[PDB]
Amino acid sequence: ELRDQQEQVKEDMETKCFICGIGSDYFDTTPHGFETHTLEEHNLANYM
Amino acid sequence: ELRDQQEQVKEDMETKCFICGIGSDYFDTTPHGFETHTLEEHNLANYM
Amino acid sequence: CTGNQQSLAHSRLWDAVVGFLHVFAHMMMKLAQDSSQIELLKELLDLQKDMVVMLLSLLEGNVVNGMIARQMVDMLVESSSNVEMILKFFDMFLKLKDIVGSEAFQDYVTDPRGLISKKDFQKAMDSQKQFTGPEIQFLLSCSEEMINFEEFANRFQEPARDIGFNVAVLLTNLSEHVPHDPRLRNFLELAESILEYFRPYLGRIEIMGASRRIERIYFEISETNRAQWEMPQVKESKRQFIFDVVNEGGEAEKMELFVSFCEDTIFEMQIAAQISETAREAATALAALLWAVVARWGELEVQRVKFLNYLSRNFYTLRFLALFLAFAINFILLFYKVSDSPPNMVYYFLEESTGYMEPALWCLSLLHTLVAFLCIIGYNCLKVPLVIFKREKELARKLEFDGLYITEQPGDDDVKGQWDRLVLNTPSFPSNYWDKFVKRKVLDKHGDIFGRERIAELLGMDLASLEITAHNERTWLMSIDVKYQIWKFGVIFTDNSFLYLGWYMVMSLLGHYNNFFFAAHLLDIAMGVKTLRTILSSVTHNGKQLVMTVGLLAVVVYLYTVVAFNFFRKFYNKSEDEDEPDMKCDDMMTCYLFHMYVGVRAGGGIGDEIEDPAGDEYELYRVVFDITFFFFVIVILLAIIQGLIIDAFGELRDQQEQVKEDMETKCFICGIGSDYFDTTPHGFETHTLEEHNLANYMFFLMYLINKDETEHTGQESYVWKMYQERCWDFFPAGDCFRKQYEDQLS
Amino acid sequence: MVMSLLGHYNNFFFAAHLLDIAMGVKTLRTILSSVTHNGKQLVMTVGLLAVVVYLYTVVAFNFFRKFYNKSEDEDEPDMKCDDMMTCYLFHMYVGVRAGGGIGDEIEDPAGDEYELYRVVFDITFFFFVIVILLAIIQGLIIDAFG
Amino acid sequence: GQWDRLVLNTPSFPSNYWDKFVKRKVLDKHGDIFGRERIAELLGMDLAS
Amino acid sequence: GDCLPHLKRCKADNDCCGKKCKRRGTNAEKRCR
Ligand SMILES: Nc1ncnc2c1ncn2[C@@H]1O[C@H](COP(=O)(O)OP(=O)(O)OP(=O)(O)O)[C@@H](O)[C@H]1O
Ligand SMILES: Nc1ncnc2c1ncn2[C@@H]1O[C@H](COP(=O)(O)OP(=O)(O)OP(=O)(O)O)[C@@H](O)[C@H]1O
Ligand SMILES: Nc1ncnc2c1ncn2[C@@H]1O[C@H](COP(=O)(O)OP(=O)(O)OP(=O)(O)O)[C@@H](O)[C@H]1O
Numbered sequence A, B: 001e002l003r004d005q006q007e008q009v010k011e012d013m014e015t016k017c018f019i020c021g022i023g024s025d026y027f028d029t030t031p032h033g034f035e036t037h038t039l040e041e042h043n044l045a046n047y048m
Numbered sequence C: 001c002t003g004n005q006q007s008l009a010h011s012r013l014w015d016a017v018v019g020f021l022h023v024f025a026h027m028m029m030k031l032a033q034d035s036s037q038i039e040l041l042k043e044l045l046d047l048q049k050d051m052v053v054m055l056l057s058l059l060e061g062n063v064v065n066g067m068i069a070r071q072m073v074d075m076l077v078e079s080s081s082n083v084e085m086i087l088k089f090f091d092m093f094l095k096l097k098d099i100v101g102s103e104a105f106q107d108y109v110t111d112p113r114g115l116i117s118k119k120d121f122q123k124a125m126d127s128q129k130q131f132t133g134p135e136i137q138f139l140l141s142c143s144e145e146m147i148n149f150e151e152f153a154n155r156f157q158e159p160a161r162d163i164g165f166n167v168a169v170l171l172t173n174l175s176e177h178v179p180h181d182p183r184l185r186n187f188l189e190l191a192e193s194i195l196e197y198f199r200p201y202l203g204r205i206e207i208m209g210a211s212r213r214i215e216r217i218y219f220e221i222s223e224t225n226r227a228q229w230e231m232p233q234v235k236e237s238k239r240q241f242i243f244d245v246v247n248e249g250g251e252a253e254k255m256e257l258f259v260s261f262c263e264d265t266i267f268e269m270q271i272a273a274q275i276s277e278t279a280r281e282a283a284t285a286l287a288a289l290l291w292a293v294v295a296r297w298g299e300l301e302v303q304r305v306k307f308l309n310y311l312s313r314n315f316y317t318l319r320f321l322a323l324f325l326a327f328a329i330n331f332i333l334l335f336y337k338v339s340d341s342p343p344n345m346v347y348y349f350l351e352e353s354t355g356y357m358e359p360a361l362w363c364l365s366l367l368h369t370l371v372a373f374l375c376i377i378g379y380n381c382l383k384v385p386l387v388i389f390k391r392e393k394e395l396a397r398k399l400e401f402d403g404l405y406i407t408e409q410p411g412d413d414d415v416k417g418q419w420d421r422l423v424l425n426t427p428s429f430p431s432n433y434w435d436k437f438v439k440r441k442v443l444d445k446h447g448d449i450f451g452r453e454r455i456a457e458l459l460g461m462d463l464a465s466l467e468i469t470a471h472n473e474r475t476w477l478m479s480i481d482v483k484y485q486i487w488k489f490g491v492i493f494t495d496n497s498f499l500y501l502g503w504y505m506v507m508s509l510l511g512h513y514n515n516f517f518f519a520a521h522l523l524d525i526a527m528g529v530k531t532l533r534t535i536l537s538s539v540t541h542n543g544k545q546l547v548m549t550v551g552l553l554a555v556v557v558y559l560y561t562v563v564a565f566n567f568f569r570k571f572y573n574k575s576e577d578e579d580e581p582d583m584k585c586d587d588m589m590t591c592y593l594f595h596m597y598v599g600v601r602a603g604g605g606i607g608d609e610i611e612d613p614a615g616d617e618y619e620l621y622r623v624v625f626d627i628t629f630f631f632f633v634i635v636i637l638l639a640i641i642q643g644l645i646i647d648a649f650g651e652l653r654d655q656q657e658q659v660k661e662d663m664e665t666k667c668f669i670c671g672i673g674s675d676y677f678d679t680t681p682h683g684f685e686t687h688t689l690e691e692h693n694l695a696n697y698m699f700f701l702m703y704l705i706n707k708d709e710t711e712h713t714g715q716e717s718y719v720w721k722m723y724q725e726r727c728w729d730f731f732p733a734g735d736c737f738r739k740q741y742e743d744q745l746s
Numbered sequence D: 001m002v003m004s005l006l007g008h009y010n011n012f013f014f015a016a017h018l019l020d021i022a023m024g025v026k027t028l029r030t031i032l033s034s035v036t037h038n039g040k041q042l043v044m045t046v047g048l049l050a051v052v053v054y055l056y057t058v059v060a061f062n063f064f065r066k067f068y069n070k071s072e073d074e075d076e077p078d079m080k081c082d083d084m085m086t087c088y089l090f091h092m093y094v095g096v097r098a099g100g101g102i103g104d105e106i107e108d109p110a111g112d113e114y115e116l117y118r119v120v121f122d123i124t125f126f127f128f129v130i131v132i133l134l135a136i137i138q139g140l141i142i143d144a145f146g
Numbered sequence E: 001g002q003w004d005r006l007v008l009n010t011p012s013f014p015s016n017y018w019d020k021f022v023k024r025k026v027l028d029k030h031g032d033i034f035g036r037e038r039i040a041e042l043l044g045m046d047l048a049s
Numbered sequence F: 001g002d003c004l005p006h007l008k009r010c011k012a013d014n015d016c017c018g019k020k021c022k023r024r025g026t027n028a029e030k031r032c033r
């Protein structure tokens, strides 16, 4: 369960945005939509 | 997990069109909808 | 025909219907007052039944909010007098018919001759508080000093079944068509006994008629229908079919298996109608508990037929008796003993209860053999014809539609295909199939194109000219065909259940030859209840993977045996005697056998039996060898095999639960989830009870089978044509009547 | 009440009062009720265990009977499989709890004409009982508790 | 069920329950159906008049 | 939609109401539990 929880943390980070939480399906319409979102829109480093 | 990954690939191909981003749920209403959608069009052999 | 319905609605039919209802109600009252006009009374309600049939036909295709129902309610309120009077008459008649069967009426009769005074009858009616004063007077007038309550009650009950059914259907259709009608609600509240009585005999099957519109179909249900539906053979068969189809997961073809199951159930219905008329105490306690928890010329011919029917009726009871007998004899077998010489090893029975065990065992074995013979005979008489019908149906359908036996070929393998090709020449092929003219159908379909002579020769027809003459007409030993009998025997000898029965018979014969052979009969405990059958199916569920893992274990053990022979031969000294040492690894076969015998079941590696290499050379090498052998055999391969078996069992149990859960949350016909129906209180229960019931669909199908084609309605004719076309588009297919008209029903 | 009353007759009867710790806590109650949650399936698995032990007992009684010798001294040999009941009790006492099959208690079959047959018998007994039936019961209890 | 049947005719059955007149309600409900005779006997109804 | 029935054949961790897609041994067909 602990290893599963760590993997699930990783998967949720890779799937759901930390800031807004919008699922990857919404950004999947455009190519590299989630990459663009995670690099420009809701990056924690950008907020920092 | 390896056996699950293999069965996962098999089930995903039995469900996903492998060309478009729409699942078999839309074509399930029409009888043999997925078979007709994957037989003539959206076929990897046809693309090759 | 929308045009005809609109013309009828816009014409002056309605005034005629009002007048007809009035005169018919008055005639019904007058003939009820009299007694010698029973023929005229029967003619009146036959004609009333026809009139309601025409009214339902007019109501066919009526939308949830249409003008037709508006004219219905307008004429209903216009002529409320006569129709209310006749519905009251029906209500009091049905109430009296129900009361005469109750203890309230039987507690007031004083004459043993089945008669009661008119004053006593009136007092009984007043006590029951069911009929009003005028109603009681009318009932008294209707009855012919003796009131003859039973004869008067049952004289008009049988004729009134058809008309009461028709009026109940009519009112149900209006109530379902246009809700929120205060006049219709009041009229429905006026008569509730009739609807309650006709509710078990009424069906509400919903099918898609045309233009993707859901329509309600009302059909006829007989008392014998539900009487025969309550048997547990048909319920068990339905459970097996639904469980299998939900494991299959097929959606497009699900209706095909449903129709096949319905046909099989109809065939079983027909066959059922045809056959219708110290340590001993502890061991004993343990066996008793196990059994308790487990349990949780013409004259000769007619006698043989009756015996076969009786044997077929109690097949399950006979199987239970056989299992109990096997348990008893094997418990008796638990008291055996061996001595060097009788009181060459000799098997002699223990004295126990003063030697009573041996004759008891002999009689138990004889009775078990007899019961097993009757069991296989009953299985042949009971379940074999269903298999024959299914096989004939499949073959006839494949030849008629697929056409892979004339246009194409069966191909390689397909032993069933070769068997089906053999019986094609046999005359009277559809002996059990309903359609006995499938050969002529496939002839007119494709034989003329494929050759009128070759196709006929392949199908083995008697004579085309003879068939034409028969259509244009305007001993027992010779009648039986050897080819049909041999084909039936061959197809019987391939069914799994018949193979199991033959194995049981062989085991019983061997037990007769040697009493110790009777232990194999307890293997039936696996088939008796579903958990042990699940375990057995789990054993072979992943057979390919299990054999692959066993092969990996074997090759790993062989490699390690080769390594041990090459280097670790010195340490393989099982014998502790230095004078005559035994070398377990002096040969490949011996060392491999020792490895597969000890090293795989040791639980701690082969090093437990091998001598300690601490005092000898190659200590580190042998320690590493033992560690890697343990890790790669017990920790990995044996655990993988065990996990395969356990997870196969778990997955089987998971599927068995998931099927039940899916059926409890989703219905079989349209598959709409219960979440949508959860808004309405008990909505899913009502849906699964009246809307999309499998029993209702099968009853409708076989009632349409019973009813003549000329009497079919438009919707019934359409559904029959669709069934004959082998294409099911009338099914809801995810469309619900309430969902379709949700806005209007709200 | 009756256990407390009988504790006066013998002090050891007070040990039954420890069941309060099992019936008190939610975890202890769940652990105790795990057995009864799937009791029918557990009893059915025990029934298959008994049936397979009976089958292998009658098999060993018919042949390989001489190998059932648990006496070290040859002066007074002890035949544990001379009777159906004794052999069944020996099997149900030793084989199921051995963890490596019935071959652990039985002497090594070396030089016998039935060496391959005895080896196959031990292999199928181990695979059918310890690997399958015991694991099935353990998994059933674990799944019920989970 | 058989234990409950035994206690139906007990005079003190309404005890520990707020609805102490349930016998009257059931008698009124089933008087028309059963003639108000068997129902009273089953529930006791000592001195109904 | 995203949530699945209790013993429905799920696809990965979460993606279900029971949120635990564990498998009972050496086999595929992960299910929510
Ligand atoms: N709001 C968010 N901002 C940034 N990343 C996010 C956000 N929500 C989810 N993520 C995910 O977090 C990850 C970003 O951190 P990541 O794990 O890539 O860092 P790293 O591997 O340590 O860095 P590197 O870029 O040097 O490889 C990505 O997988 C991204 O999809
Ligand atoms: N875009 C796609 N192109 C091809 N196949 C697809 C596609 N999307 C899904 N599929 C699935 O993959 C299948 C193709 O592989 P398939 O299993 O038929 O191969 P095969 O076993 O070699 O062939 P055969 O069915 O003749 O035995 C399709 O039938 C379909 O179920
Ligand atoms: N199309 C359907 N027809 C009938 N029942 C259905 C259908 N779809 C789902 N069900 C479910 O089946 C049950 C009713 O039929 P079923 O015969 O299985 O009842 P049961 O109460 O389990 O009794 P038994 O099977 O012994 O007759 C209900 O749980 C109902 O939700």
Ligand SMILES: Cn1c(=O)c2c(ncn2C)n(C)c1=O
Binding pocket: C263, C264, C266, C267, C270, C434, C705
């Ligand atoms: C007369 N009849 C049957 O007797 C029958 C059937 N399907 C199965 N049976 C047994 N059909 C469709 C049929 O019309």
Ligand SMILES: [Ca+2]
Binding pocket: C709, C710, C711, C712
């Ligand atoms: Ca007609």
Ligand SMILES: [Zn+2]
Binding pocket: A017, A018, A019, A020, A021, A022, A037, A041, A042
């Ligand atoms: Zn975001």
Ligand SMILES: [Zn+2]
Binding pocket: B017, B018, B019, B020, B021, B022, B037, B042
């Ligand atoms: Zn596509």
Ligand SMILES: [Zn+2]
Binding pocket: C667, C668, C669, C670, C671, C672, C687, C692
């Ligand atoms: Zn439905």
